[PDB]
Amino acid sequence: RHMQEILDAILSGDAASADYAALALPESYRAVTLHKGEERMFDGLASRDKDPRKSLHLDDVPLPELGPGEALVAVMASSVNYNTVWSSIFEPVSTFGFLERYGRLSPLTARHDLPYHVLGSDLAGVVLRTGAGVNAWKPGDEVVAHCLSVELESPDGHNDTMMDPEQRIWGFETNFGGLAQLALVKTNQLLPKPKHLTWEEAASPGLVNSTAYRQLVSRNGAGLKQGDNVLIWGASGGLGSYATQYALAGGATPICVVSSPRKADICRAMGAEAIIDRSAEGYRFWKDEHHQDPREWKRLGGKIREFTGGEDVDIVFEHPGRETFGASVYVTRKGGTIVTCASTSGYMHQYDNRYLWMSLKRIVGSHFANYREAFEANRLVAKGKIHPTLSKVYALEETGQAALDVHHNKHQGKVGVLCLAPREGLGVTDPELRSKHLTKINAFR
Amino acid sequence: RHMQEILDAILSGDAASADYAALALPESYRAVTLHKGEERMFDGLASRDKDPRKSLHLDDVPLPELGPGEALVAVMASSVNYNTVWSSIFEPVSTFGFLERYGRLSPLTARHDLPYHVLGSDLAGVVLRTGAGVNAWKPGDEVVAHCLSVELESPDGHNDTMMDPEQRIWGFETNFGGLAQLALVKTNQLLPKPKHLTWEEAASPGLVNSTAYRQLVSRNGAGLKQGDNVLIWGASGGLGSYATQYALAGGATPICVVSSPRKADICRAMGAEAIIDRSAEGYRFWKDEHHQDPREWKRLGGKIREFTGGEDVDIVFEHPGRETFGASVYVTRKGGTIVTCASTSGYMHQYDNRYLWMSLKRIVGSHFANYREAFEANRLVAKGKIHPTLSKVYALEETGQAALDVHHNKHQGKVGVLCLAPREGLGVTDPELRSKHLTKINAFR
Amino acid sequence: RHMQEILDAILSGDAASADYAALALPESYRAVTLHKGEERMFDGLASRDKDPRKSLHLDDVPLPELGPGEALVAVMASSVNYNTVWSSIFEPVSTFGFLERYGRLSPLTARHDLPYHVLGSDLAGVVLRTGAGVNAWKPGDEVVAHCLSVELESPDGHNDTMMDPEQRIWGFETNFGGLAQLALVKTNQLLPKPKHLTWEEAASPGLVNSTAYRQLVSRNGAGLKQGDNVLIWGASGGLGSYATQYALAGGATPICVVSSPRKADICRAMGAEAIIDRSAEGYRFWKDEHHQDPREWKRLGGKIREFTGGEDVDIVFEHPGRETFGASVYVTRKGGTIVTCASTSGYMHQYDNRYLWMSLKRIVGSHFANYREAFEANRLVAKGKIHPTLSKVYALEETGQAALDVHHNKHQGKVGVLCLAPREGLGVTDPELRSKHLTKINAFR
Amino acid sequence: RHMQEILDAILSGDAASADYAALALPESYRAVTLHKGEERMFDGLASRDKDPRKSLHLDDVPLPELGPGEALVAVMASSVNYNTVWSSIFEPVSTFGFLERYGRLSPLTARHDLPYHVLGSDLAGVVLRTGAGVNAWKPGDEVVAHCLSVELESPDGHNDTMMDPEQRIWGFETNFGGLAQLALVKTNQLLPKPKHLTWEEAASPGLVNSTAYRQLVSRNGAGLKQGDNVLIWGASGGLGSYATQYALAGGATPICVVSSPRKADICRAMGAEAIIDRSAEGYRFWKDEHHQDPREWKRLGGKIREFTGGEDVDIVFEHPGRETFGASVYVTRKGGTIVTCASTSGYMHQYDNRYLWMSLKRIVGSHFANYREAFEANRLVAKGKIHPTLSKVYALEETGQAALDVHHNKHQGKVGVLCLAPREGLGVTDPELRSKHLTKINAFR
Ligand SMILES: NC(=O)C1=CN([C@@H]2O[C@@H](COP(=O)(O)OP(=O)(O)OC[C@H]3O[C@@H](n4cnc5c(N)ncnc54)[C@H](OP(=O)(O)O)[C@@H]3O)[C@H](O)[C@@H]2O)C=CC1
Ligand SMILES: NC(=O)C1=CN([C@@H]2O[C@@H](COP(=O)(O)OP(=O)(O)OC[C@H]3O[C@@H](n4cnc5c(N)ncnc54)[C@H](OP(=O)(O)O)[C@@H]3O)[C@H](O)[C@@H]2O)C=CC1
Ligand SMILES: NC(=O)C1=CN([C@@H]2O[C@@H](COP(=O)(O)OP(=O)(O)OC[C@H]3O[C@@H](n4cnc5c(N)ncnc54)[C@H](OP(=O)(O)O)[C@@H]3O)[C@H](O)[C@@H]2O)C=CC1
Ligand SMILES: NC(=O)C1=CN([C@@H]2O[C@@H](COP(=O)(O)OP(=O)(O)OC[C@H]3O[C@@H](n4cnc5c(N)ncnc54)[C@H](OP(=O)(O)O)[C@@H]3O)[C@H](O)[C@@H]2O)C=CC1
């Protein structure tokens, strides 16, 4: 069987590029899919009551046709992201609608409109084949992927590709995602695998790490500098588990927000010291459905100042959205920045503009990362400066359960998924660098 | 009488600096004031039902003691600003609340905590006296004032003085404003009077012109460049009457929003062609008290694209606030900027964050201007590149009516006020430059 | 004959996309070429004694194979650039070296490694065919080109493509340039043709205009704002002319430097008023081959201040290099910027660093433009805000003489070349916009 | 004796603000001075043969009159800076030329135009008296002083005070410097003393730490971010000993250049790993005295790449000037920044502009720091994130020897000077924080 021979060559460690080019491609591959017919199955239920285990299937699907500028990748491991969860509960809309509408553009785009949607927006693995015009990547190259799919035909993205008007999120607005044994990506999504990490660890930072890097570190986001005070909501989640690391590695002070003493201890394990538990404080920023309580804004602001010696934060790392956003704007220092990439609790934000203009603050929208920012974020991982935050790993066959844990907030850092990898622990080729950092690497386990 | 002697010297033309130094200072001056006792006379009434004529008094007040780094200015003219309106209807709080609590600091700021409040945040006039440490300005100098009052003892303002924690607005959070025959200002508020303008014209740009300059032109605001498309709310109001000029003079395209065809004609007189009447289009961005209508946002966005050839705006010049802010965020181009210095219609903003993060937009809060920005804005006026926008002039005794007109929105550009100047038309000393630009200078009359 | 039928289709004005798709591609096309065998013919000669008429041949060459993301363009007109002239004298090295070495990379790059090299880095024309993966452009589209050729496989260019490490300049480091009846370009080189211009006018701004735009207008260069004073060396040259237009269109003040009273008249024709004749002033910035004369820097600075009312320039637009650079650093305002894209007089620059650090100045290097900047620069042409500067037009068969003209600086404006266009004056489809700007369009004739 | 009673009050540790206010001011104070007579004395000699011990005098000088916004400070300790060395060798120009022509401005600045010059640009001590208009600082306050003297009457400095046209360096371009028992400073030079440091340690970072902070960390300089590679010339000198710390604490990689293995060991003690010894490597960047050797530039570049895994530096921290500047421009990464605040080896820089424009690099001039940058730099010291780098301390009477050591390169630290402090080791009031950082605090000893 051809898939087993691909895995055997990977595990062998001796296969050269010519060997991979010679290996026969399988005729099908195992993939975690949504089914088009079942897209209304959660109709009328509440969001908590929607169960990804009901809609996620394990299918054998044919290999898509390789186009120019693309690579076929044998996937050793992937991860669950929030966008995967939303996809699995057909929220906010069935991902199938875009796939069909986009597919009518050209024959190449049409490959993605199918009765099934292969999900997954992270990958770690090995290049099998490359389409026409590809020089920078060869069969056998060990890779991770970022999830930005840009065509770059418009000039708009040529000073920062996040401005491309035709940007899709791989595995979400494209098919052939990474929760599968094989994946199709553009070669400009490919990055060198950090050699000191396992397959599942290498696959875990991708989406959240690059997002946090752009949002906090890069000049396209908050432009952090050493000495800054930074409020980090959700500091032990996927995004926060990288944002906290960037604040500390950058010489800044994180004020970490968590919802349980258990999460607080992980932040201390990361090296943070100023930690706020939103439950124990019992913040109620909203009096009712339509009115906020500035007394509760001010109470958050006083709690921050206890940790900073009377200083207000230079940057708020936002993502919870409507519930917290009025407080985020209020507590930010004169001249400071609220940077936002999400609105988990609701996207209709309300805030008092007097604080924004009279104190010269700014709200900066950020989304994923361009290839240079993705490369820089992955490079900091490769250098041992930023660490994966895996808490639990599931086999591909159990992806539905992994999605539900994330949906219900059962875990802390990243939830990983094995794909072709037969067990955890494989893929390390820099044991010296790994052993220097193993304690941090395992801090979320 | 010593006030007449001061005016006669100014009107004369050959008074040297020594002559002004030798003039006797009056023991009192006429000023437009609020009265501490009356500070709640409008409590219980509705916003449109407070008439500033009820709360604005013409009193004779003693001269304050001159301090270090300050100047006593004989005021030839001033203007009404919206903050003057807000002051006169003791809304949102009595300006006395500030004055009172501050004066407890230093005996110098204590001079401002009085039972009356001399209003006014613009001036054009002549320096009479300077306090200790004043080298750049001398008696007899023709000046306009910007309204930034900064102490600059804190380090915070030394990379942009707007960030000074003690940054106040002169005549609003300080006493001895410009709607009076004399005023007290810091000498770092002083700028050279544009020689081609009359006293009342020279006093009209100060507050709104410098604010629009920082908001739209400077790198501390939207950083406009030629080719940009800029949506300008209230394009024929105080702020808009300068923002439109900066867009056109900078090589950009303003899309001007007004509420009457009469105001549309002024915008065409300024050189603009893309004009939207919000009354005629009947935008109703809010369905009910708590929900907006995204179909109305899209309708604005389509109308803009009719003027731009399918392009979305790079910058939104905001200030109306809650009524328009959701639409402003929606219509902005991917990567664009919404810049806001106010919220006339309500400061509790609501917007859909999905548009802000998924299209990488930013909301930038802006407030007045630092001295360098104020100087640059006044310099463009002095060079004839930006023109005053006076529509109507009142005598000092009629300031109450001037404020009512702005309160109810009877006027268009700036409403000016004569102080010591006995009639309009005085104070020009560069007649050739004035003749070059008079048609534009008079565009709002 | 197939080439004639392509031209007939273009001149007809009613050919639809499907019509172009069905046209027969010729077997050969006529092209201006260098010959590998002759690359040593000028060895031993001074630069000004090398004659491009001796090295430039008119050949019939076969059509290259169309690759992914590429377009075959029927070229109506092109222009002579400085890089074309240098290539024609095999300076600084022969262009064949790069074509050979680069051709070793892959079969696609090998297409360019030929015994002949078709030169030309500007184009205006009509798309004939597009390779695999192209949806933005289609047969029949009227285009101009920018000359940046980037693969974008490296992440480096994904936040500003000028940072791409393996960039080529089309027609200089690639084959199939624009001085020919057909050309091969990447589709990410294509821009919409300005409809109000003729073929030869539309082909003229490209390289020099986008370069000046990035250098002066964009935030990657000097970030011009209205009110700035800008010193522009060679203000009537190819580059200095577009810089002068950008200064004026953005509301800044150019201080134009020229070498003759007739060149001063060109600057006045462009709308500039502050003009300095370095020949009349007799500046000798260098006392000998190794020592500069600071008293001559000072003389330039005083003369500048005569035009600005005592103000030093915010920006120096540099390109002459060693001769002028010390003076450019000297005269720049405290906090100002010297932006440089060339060193025509010599690339070993000498300056007094005391002025740079003690007055907090910066020198910013700039080079060509990314696709977004090229689009914005061409869009300002399409809007009628920036105008082509054609001074003389040659037919394709006379390209050798056009190159000599540029080599000996016989013209102040761009030198254009007709390719397929049978005469000047064709290709206008927005005659109303043309009429409005006709006098400016012809200012360099 | 009044001076002795001031020192006793400080050493007692229980003197209140009112006790300092009641202390009798001395009528003279001991100071390190230059003499305007001794003006010319080193002319005709070479730089190394200039002995500061001949030109630096220990005189008794009368107290200057205190002005508005100023403070008289009892100086416990100071430091030697390079500007002290340049002052003492009257080189390039005499500092008297500054002092002298200035004071003819205002009677307040005229106090500084004296026949002697009290040197010193750092201080740690205790406020004794404040002038009119001072609220933020009071007698008894423990302070360090930054050396920025700005008048701020001009608007130019109000968006970054370094742009004030009257910006000066206290103790170098002004009188009453800190190498003395008393000093006169503007209160906007005052910063809170770090409580965990001794007087001499607290005085040592001021000038070079704030300069390195602006140059490397702030957005007004290089804008460092974690992951950047930074080449740091003179990494164990004054400036470099802070620049190296900022690189490491901000998550970047310094490539440190020193001239002895002993200095290399200190860099390793600071936490750096990539270290280049310029003497051992034998770089000779200048062929003759008018020509450089690009083979030597390339050799440095390959040495850097050995440390970075083949990456070129994002930032070069320059200050040696002519000898190294050509290399610095060459080795910088494409799109990178060379930031320079000095030219120790000669201010006539020469560099190859081809590397700057073709690789889109920039040279950014930087000079000291504004009050906000100085506050942020001192705050990082106060938080124990940046440490002082004292190597040796001299008594006030031996300042000439201290100057000579820096002039010839005998030491590596900052070299500190006791003023009123009778011995080393006094002034710590936060011993717990000191203990946490003592090993790093003493790394240069
Ligand atoms: N490129 C983009 O634009 C990206 C967006 N995303 C995100 O997708 C989702 C994933 O974020 P991710 O970190 O991976 O998911 P996680 O669940 O792993 O972490 C999110 C954290 O947010 C906190 N949180 C949730 N709700 C609230 C609330 N109402 N108030 C305060 N805190 C709250 C929780 O931390 P705790 O309970 O401990 O307080 C939670 O753990 C987000 O919605 C965002 O859209 C992610 C990557 C990229
Ligand atoms: N932070 C700062 O430094 C400064 C703030 N301010 C301003 O005070 C307030 C007044 O500004 P100013 O220009 O002098 O006042 P004006 O009244 O002169 O102009 C404001 C314009 O806004 C328009 N407008 C008013 N209400 C609405 C609405 N509900 N929706 C849409 N448009 C509306 C009106 O134009 P039309 O009806 O024709 O559409 C009006 O002309 C500004 O909003 C801001 O607070 C001013 C200067 C500085
Ligand atoms: N980096 C890039 O992307 C680009 C660079 N270029 C440059 O093109 C060439 C120069 O630009 P371009 O304007 O098109 O060429 P032009 O010949 O059309 O103009 C050059 C101008 O330089 C002036 N000049 C030359 N030498 C001196 C001197 N010693 N002192 C003062 N002025 C001098 C002359 O002014 P005189 O007329 O005073 O009156 C001349 O007009 C270079 O080769 C360079 O490559 C061009 C396009 C792009
Ligand atoms: N603009 C501003 O505000 C400031 C400027 N300065 C600068 O001070 C001087 C440097 O400051 P500072 O750090 O206090 O002085 P230091 O003497 O303490 O350190 C300077 C370092 O530069 C190295 N160096 C000296 N000469 C050369 C050379 N020819 N080539 C390469 N490296 C060299 C030396 O290290 P090694 O021998 O180990 O290689 C030396 O340690 C500058 O001249 C200027 O005065 C300083 C502070 C502020």
Same domain, B108 and B206: yes
Residue C120: HSE in the Cβ half-sphere, 13 Å Cα cutoff: 36
Q: How many Å apart are CA B326 and CA B321, to the nearest integer?
A: 9
Nearest Cβ partner for D226 among A219, A227, A249: A249
Same domain, A9 and A139: yes
Q: Mutate which of A122, A236, A256, A259 to test ligand 1's pocket (most atoms within 8 Å of Cβ)?
A: A259
Residue window 195-234, chain A: list those with CB within 8 Å of chain B: 220
In sequence order, what are the residues at sequence separation of 6 or more whose Cβ sits closer than 8 angstroms to the Cβ of residue D435? none
Alpha-carbon gap, residue D408 to D402, rounded angstroms: 10
Strands C70-80 and C182-186: antiparallel
A375 and A296 in a common domain: no
Cβ-based burial of B408 (10 A; exposed 0-12, middle 13-18, buried ≥19): exposed
Contacts of D336 in chain C (CB under 8 A): none
Q: Would you list the DSSP string of C345-394?
A: T-SEEEEEHHHHHHTT-EEEE--S--HHHHHHHHHHHHTTSS---EEEEE
Q: Does A211 belong to an annotated binding site?
A: yes
Alpha carbon of residue D354 to chain centroid: 34
Answer yes or no: do B353 and A160 touch at CB < 8 A.
no
The angle, 0 to 180 degrees and rounded to 10, between the axes of the packed helices B240-249 and B261-270 is: 40
> How far does the CA of residue B139 sit from the closest CA of chain C (Å)?
24
Q: Residue A349 is nearest to which of B160, B220, B353, comparing CB atoms?
A: B353
Out of C308, C332, C367, pick the residue that ends a domain: C367
State how far the Cα of C29 lies from the Cα of C175, in Å rounded to an integer. Answer: 14
Collapsing DSSP to helix, strand or coil, B241 comes out as helix
* Residue (of D356, D416, D366, D429) closest to D388 by Cα position: D416
Instruction: Give the residue among A276, A272, A367, A288 at the shortest CA–CA distance from A328.
Output: A276
* D340–C353 C-beta distance less than 8 A: yes
Chain D hits for B382, CB-CB cut-off 8 Å, are none
State whether C102 and C142 are in the same domain. Answer: yes
Is residue A4 located within the same domain as residue A91? yes
Clarify whether residues A4 and A144 are in a common domain.
Answer: yes
Question: How much is the CA Rg of chain C, to the nearest whole Å?
Answer: 22
CB B41, CB B91: distance < 8 Å: no
Q: Compute and round to an integer the Cα radius of gyration of chain A.
A: 22
Nearest atom in ligand 2 to the alpha carbon of residue B83 is: 8
- The angle subtended at Cα D307 by Cα D301 and Cα D309, nearest 5°, is 95
Concatenate the DSSP letters of all residues of B136-172 into one string: S--TT-EEEE--EE----SGGGGGSGGG-TT-EETTT
Which two tokens mark B333?
Answer: 């181009």
D17's enclosing H/E stretch is helix D17-22
- Residue D440 tokens read as 């790093």
Fill in the amino acid letter for C106.
S
Q: How many Å is the Cα radius of gyration of chain D?
A: 22
* Ramachandran assignment for D436, one of left (phi > 0), alpha (psi -120 to 50 degrees), beta (any other): alpha
H helix runs in B309-351, sequence order: 322-331
Q: What determination technique applies here?
A: X-ray
**Which one of C239, C297, C325 would you pick to mutate in the ligand 3 pocket, going by the greatest count of ligand atoms within 8 A of its CB?**
C239
Task: Verify whether the Cβ–Cβ distance D372 to B152 is below 8 Å.
Answer: no
Cα–Cα distance between D400 and D85 in angstroms, integer? 9
Please return the burial class of A22, using the count of CB atoms within 10 Å of its CB with bins 0-12, 13-18 and 19+. exposed
- Residue among C134, C107, C148, C73 at smallest CA distance from A132: C107
Tokens 């921050």 correspond to what residue?
A304
| Element of type H or E holding D395 | strand D390-395
Cis check: omega of the bond before A422, within 30 degrees of 0: no
CB under 8 Å to B392, separation ≥6 — which residues?
A: B402, B405, B411, B415, B416, B445
Q: Which of D133, D159, D187 sits opposite B68 (nearest CB)?
A: D133
Is residue B146 within 8 Å of B97, Cβ to Cβ? Answer: no
Instruction: Judge whether B232 and B319 are in contact, CB under 8 Å.
Output: no
- Tokens coding B276: 């939207």
Q: What is the resolution of this structure in A?
A: 1.8
For residues A439 and A434, give the distance between their C-alpha atoms in angstroms, rounded to a whole number. Answer: 9
Q: Are B90 and B119 in contact (CB under 8 A)?
A: no
H-only helix segments in B13-145: 17-22, 52-55, 82-88, 95-102, 107-110
Distance CA C200, CA C423 (A): 10
Q: Residue B214 and residue B370: Cα distance in Å, rounded?
A: 8
Pocket of ligand 3 (CB under 6 A): C 82, 207-208, 211, 233-234, 236-240, 257-259, 263, 278, 319-320, 323-324, 341-342, 344-345, 367-368, 409; D 357
Cα end-to-end span (Å), chain D: 35
DSSP classification of residue B311: P
Token couple for D245: 């710390």
A239 marked as part of a ligand binding site? yes
Q: How far is D335 from A159, CA to CA, in rounded Å?
A: 13
Q: How far is CA C294 from CA A360, C255, D93, D195, in A?
A: 44, 20, 16, 48
- Report yes or no: D370 and C335 within 8 Å, Cβ to Cβ: no
* CB neighbourhood size of B33 (10 A): 23
Residues 6 or more apart whose Cβ sits within 8 Å of residue A351:
A325, A326, A328, A329, A330, B348, B349
Q: Is the peptide bond before C107 cis (omega within 30 degrees of 0)?
A: no
Residue D338 contacts residue C365 (beta carbons within 8 Å): no
Task: Answer yes or no: are the C-beta atoms of C163 and C148 closer than 8 Å.
Answer: no
Q: Whose CA is closest to D182, among D66, D84, D260?
A: D66
Number of alpha carbons in the 13 Å side-chain half-sphere of residue C432: 0
Cβ proximity of B123 and B147 under 8 Å: no
Residues of D37-71 as b/e, b for ≥16 C-beta within 10 angstroms?
A: ebeeebeeeeeeebbbeebbeeeebeebebbbbbb
Beta-strand ranges (E) seen in A280-370 are: 315-318, 337-340, 348-352, 362-365
Structural tokens at position D107: 């009677």
- How far apart are alpha carbons C315 and B418 in whole angstroms? 41
**What is the total count of domains within chain B?**
2
> Which ligand 1 atom minimizes the distance to the CA of A278?
39
CA-closest candidate to residue D171, choices D417, D422, D379, D412? D417
Residue C177 near residue C102, CB atoms below 8 Å? no
Number of helices (H), then strands (E), belonging to chain B: the values are 17, 19
Alpha-carbon torsion (D227, D231, D234, D240), positive or negative: negative
- The pair of structure tokens assigned to B124 is 């054009």
Q: From edge to edge, which strands make up the β-sheet containing D57-62?
A: D57-62, D28-35, D116-118
| Polymer length in residues for chain C | 445
Domain CATH code at residue C315: 3.40.50.720
Query: What does the alpha-carbon distance between residue C409 and residue A363 come to, in Å, rounded to a whole number?
Result: 52
Instruction: Return all residues near D420 (Cβ < 8 A) that are at least 6 apart.
Output: D3, D6, D7, D10, D74, D75, D76, D125, D181
Q: How far apart are CA D97 and CA D39, in angstroms?
A: 10
Residues A312/A316/A322/A327 CA torsion (nearest 10 deg): 0
B154/D220 Cβ within 8 A: no
Q: Tell me, yes or no, whether D65 and D28 share the same domain.
A: yes
Query: Strands (DSSP E) along A269-375, which ranges?
Result: 274-277, 315-318, 337-340, 348-352, 362-365
Compute φ and ψ for C356, nearest 5 degrees: -70, -50
Same domain, A423 and A329: no
Maximum C-alpha span of chain C: 69
Q: Does residue A278 sit in helix, strand or coil?
A: helix
Residue B156: CATH number of its domain:
3.90.180.10
Answer with the one of A367, A388, A404 that is the final residue of a domain.
Answer: A367
> Of the candidates D268, D249, D248, D250, which has an alpha carbon nearest to the alpha carbon of residue D258?
D268
Residues C149 and C255 in one domain: no
Q: Which amino acid belongs to residue D375? A: F
SS (H, E, C) A360-400: CCEEEECCCCCHHHHHHHHHHHHCCCCCCCEEEEEEHHHHH
Count of beta carbons in the 10 Å neighbourhood of residue A153: 20
Task: Give the H/E segment covering residue C47.
Answer: none
- Where b means 16+ CB within 10 Å and e means fewer, A277-306 reads bbeeeebebbeeeeebbeebbebbbeebbe
Q: Domain range holding B183?
A: 1-220+368-445
Give yes or no for a contact between C126 and C141, defined as CB atoms under 8 angstroms apart: yes
Burial D383-421 (b: 16+ CB within 10 A, else e): ebbbbbbbbbbbebebbbbbbbbbbeeebbbbbbbbbbb
Residue C282 and residue C214 in one domain: no
Question: For tokens 């770089």, what's the residue?
Answer: D283
Helix (H, G, I), strand (E, B) or coil at B111: coil
Closest CA to B199 of B178, B213, B170, B184: B178
DSSP A191-230: EEPPTTS-HHHHHSSHHHHHHHIIIIISTTTT---TT-EE
Provide φ and ψ at B70, rounded to 5°: -120, 165
Residue written as token pair 């913040």: A283
The partner residues of B183 in beta bridges, in order of sequence, read B73
The alpha helices in D149-277, defined as continuous H runs, are: 199-203, 206-212, 238-249, 261-270
Give the whole-angstrom CA distance, residue C398 versus residue C392.
12
Contact C165 D367 (CB under 8 A): no
Q: Which residue pairs, CB below 8 angstroms and at least 24 apart, start in B306-311?
A: B307/B255, B307/B273, B307/B274, B307/B276, B308/B229, B308/B253, B308/B255, B308/B274, B311/B229
* Rounded CA separation C430/C247 (Å): 26
d(CA D9, CA D20): 8
Instruction: Tell me the two tokens of residue D320.
Output: 């040696």
Going from the Cα of B405 to the center of ligand 2, the distance in angstroms, rounded, reads 13
Residue A415 corresponds to which tokens in the numbers above? 């939830």
Is residue D316 within 8 Å of residue D328, measured between CB atoms? yes
Give D324's Cβ-side CA count (13 Å radius).
26
B246/C249 Cβ within 8 A: no
Query: How far is A144 from A71, CA to CA, in rounded Å?
Result: 12
Could B108 and D187 be called an inter-chain contact, meaning their C-beta atoms sit closer than 8 Å?
A: no
Supply B143's token pair.
């000046």
Cβ neighbours of residue C309 closer than 8 Å, sequence gap 6 or more:
none
Contact A357 CB / ligand 2 (< 6 Å): yes
Q: Which two structure tokens, joined as six digits, stand for D420?
A: 């009123």
Q: Residues B200, B206, B207, B209: what is their CA dihedral angle, to the nearest 10 degrees?
A: 110
Distance from C-alpha of B122 to C-alpha of B145, rounded to nearest angstrom: 6
Q: Is the peptide bond before D107 cis (omega within 30 degrees of 0)?
A: no
Considering just the CA atoms, what is the radius of gyration of chain B in Å?
22
Cα separation, D208 vs D241, in Å, equals: 9
Same domain, D306 and D386: no
Domain boundary among A317, A334, A367: A367
Burial of residue C288 (CB within 10 Å: 0-12, 13-18, 19+) is: exposed
CA distance C94 to D163: 48
Whether residue D185 sits in one domain with residue D150? yes
Q: Measured between CA atoms, how close is B120 to chain A, in angstroms?
A: 19
